[PDB]
Each structure stands twice: as C-alpha cells, then as structure tokens.
Symmetry: none
C-alpha cells in the first residue's frame, strides 16, 4: 500500500528545479505526479529544495495545523515553492493550472519514525 | 571522454519514438548505439519519453539499486520502453535481439551535479 511519507514526496517534492521555470510547470508537474488521475486535484504546492532541507522543517517551529491537530511545523527560512491552482475552466480530463513561483515558509504535518512530512498544510 | 550520462543517453534514451514499431527495432538500435562493438551485449532497454522526463525520475521515488547502492530512483509514472534480448542465432559479429515493448515503471541510477540518469537498473 503506498505510505503516507511517500505520498507527500510524490505530491510535493521537486529538488531538480530551482523553482517553477515556466507557466507550464503545473499542468505537467501535477499530471506526472498522478495528481490528475481520478479528478482535478484543485490546488497543490511543490517544494524545490532538498528532501533533507524539507524533512528538517519537521524539527523547526511547532505550529497548530489548520485541522486543529498539533503535528505541524513551520519553515524558519523561506523556501522556493511552486504553487499550483486549478483555473476556473480547469475540467477533469483537461485539468489546467496557474503556476506561481514564490519564496515562503511552509507548514507540514509530521509522523512516524524517521520523523518526516506526511501532509502539506500551508505556505506563509 | 564520453560522459556516463552521454553514455546512458546513447545506451537507452529513445525520444523519437513512442515505442518500437516492429520486432526489428531491437537489432537496429543495439548496433547503432555501439553496443555490439567488442561483443554482443545480451540485454538492454530503450526508453521512449523525453530526456527531460527521464532526468525527472531522478527526483521521484528513492529505491535501492540492484547492487544495494541507493542512488536509484523509481518512476511515479509508467513509461513505454522497448526490451532487447539476445536471441539464440545471435552470434557476435552477428548479434540478434528479441524486441519486447511495454509500458512499465523504470529505475535509474543518478550521479554527479546536474543529477542525471547514469545507469539503467530495471523496469517494473
């Protein structure tokens, strides 16, 4: 069964780009991650920094997650992220996305042994 | 001297084809890619997606290489590859290959700075 730790890397990690490099990053990036498989996942954030630089956020500032649960942590440093949003107009099997490059702190939910990111909570 | 990745690119990149269109793709390719120069290489797989998308597996699912080395990576997406097997009848200077075509997940060894595919570990 795909694990929660691998799901996060599949949906949010991208260490080979320094940042989204063109307006098409999202449309392809999202599909290759199989995020358009059963339907337009509507919004998705990608991080272009090391898995370690990211797993390390799990030891950074502890913050309450948007769900009220307390396993979240916020990046001390800002990180290159690429934000991906379904456009009005985006429509399952033709899902379409606006790609925004940004540098901001991220919030991830952490769990298990290595302690690593299992859910992407938000960028600030 | 040919780089390990230029070599990877010569031994398995095949981006001009969606896939092998005949049982003779294999005999044709094995020879041109210089792999039958000193002996009949017995086994070898060609991948039919952009170099961009193979290099992209280098940020995909970390997996252990056949040798225990961990700089291997498994493709989130399945890919069309053509499998080439040395046939009985094949006799070095007359190498013959069985051509097998499928859509499967691939495993690459990655190395250096750009991080790129240098080794074909396996298809799943």
């Amino acid at each position: 069964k795909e694990t929660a730790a691998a799901k996060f890397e599949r949906q949010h990690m991208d260490s080979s780009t320094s940042a989204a490099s063109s307006s098409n990053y999202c449309n392809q990036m999202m599909k290759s991650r199989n995020l358009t498989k059963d339907r337009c996942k509507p919004v998705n954030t990608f991080v272009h920094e090391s898995l370690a630089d990211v797993q390390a956020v799990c030891s950074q500032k502890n913050v309450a997650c948007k769900n009220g649960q307390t396993n979240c942590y916020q990046s001390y440093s800002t990180m290159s992220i690429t934000d991906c949003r379904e456009t009005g107009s985006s429509k399952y099997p033709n899902c379409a996305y606006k790609t925004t490059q940004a540098n901001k702190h991220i919030i991830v939910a952490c769990e298990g042994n290595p302690y690593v990111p299992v859910h992407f909570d938000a960028s600030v």
